[PDB]
Amino acid sequence: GPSGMILKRAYDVTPQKISTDKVRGVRKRVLIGLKDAPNFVMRLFTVEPGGLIDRHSHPWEHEIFVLKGKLTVLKEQGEETVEEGFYIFVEPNEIHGFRNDTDSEVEFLCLIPKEGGE
Amino acid sequence: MILKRAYDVTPQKISTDKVRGVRKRVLIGLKDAPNFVMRLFTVEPGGLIDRHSHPWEHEIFVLKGKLTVLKEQGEETVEEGFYIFVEPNEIHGFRNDTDSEVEFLCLIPKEGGE
Numbered sequence: 362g363p364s365g366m367i368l369k370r371a372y373d374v375t376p377q378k379i380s381t382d383k384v385r386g387v388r389k390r391v392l393i394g395l396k397d398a399p400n401f402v403m404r405l406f407t408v409e410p411g412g413l414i415d416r417h418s419h420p421w422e423h424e425i426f427v428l429k430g431k432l433t434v435l436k437e438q439g440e441e442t443v444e445e446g447f448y449i450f451v452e453p454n455e456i457h458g459f460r461n462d463t464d465s466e467v468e469f470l471c472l473i474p475k476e477g478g479e
Numbered sequence: 480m481i482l483k484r485a486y487d488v489t490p491q492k493i494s495t496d497k498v499r500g501v502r503k504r505v506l507i508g509l510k511d512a513p514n515f516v517m518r519l520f521t522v523e524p525g526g527l528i529d530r531h532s533h534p535w536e537h538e539i540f541v542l543k544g545k546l547t548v549l550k551e552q553g554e555e556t557v558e559e560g561f562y563i564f565v566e567p568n569e570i571h572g573f574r575n576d577t578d579s580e581v582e583f584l585c586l587i588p589k590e591g592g593e
């Protein structure tokens with residue numbers, strides 16, 4: 362593949378609205394996308410106040426790092442809120458979702474193997 | 480599912496001929512991860528990761544402070560809120576020229592170890 366290094370302010374990427382049957386009040390920035398990533402992609406998600414990523418699962422893992430705010434994590438059984446400075450590992454096929462119960466934006470980094478897209 | 484405060488992971492001090500004033504936390508390691516690992520590095524004031532390369536990429540996010548990134552030639556400082564993509568085989572390293580600790584998240588494919 363190519364050489365070099367990219368160094369960029371994440372906020373220089375516009376936050377794009379995610380709207381699907383199971384996601385509302387969420388925006389995403391693709392930081393290191395399919396066009397460049399050899400193995401895995403880096404996204405920055407913004408959950409607006411009251412935003413929801415419904416419980417779901419997929420046949421790849423998630424690696425998450427919470428950057429800002431209080432993120433409510435939905436589990437197969439119940440939920441738990443974590444804050445900036447927490448990491449999350451979600452196994453392949455594990456049920457998970459997210460909610461923002463606060464009045465400010467919540468941000469988290471989310472990385473997946475590139476076979477799951479960007 | 481694992482949910483944990485990164486700070487609570489015990490950092491490992493690194494002090495070698497090429498790395499000094501650096502601590503490393505393995506957040507999501509080989510034990511858990513099927514494809515890539517998540518580390519958090521803390522660079523003390525004056526700390527240094529000297530120029531090196533490896534056959535895998537880095538994906539980095541700067542969490543705190545002003546990080547000096549060493550390039551094959553020259554260097555570039557970036558701040559909290561920057562991401563960095565280092566291509567496989569690219570010469571790189573890091574320095575902290577400030578008076579406070581710098582933190583960055585760093586992910587590599589699992590062939591890189593943890």
Ligand SMILES: [Mn+2]
Nearest residue numbers: 417419423457
């Ligand atoms: Mn998911």
Ligand SMILES: [Mn+2]
Nearest residue numbers: 531533537571
């Ligand atoms: Mn390296």
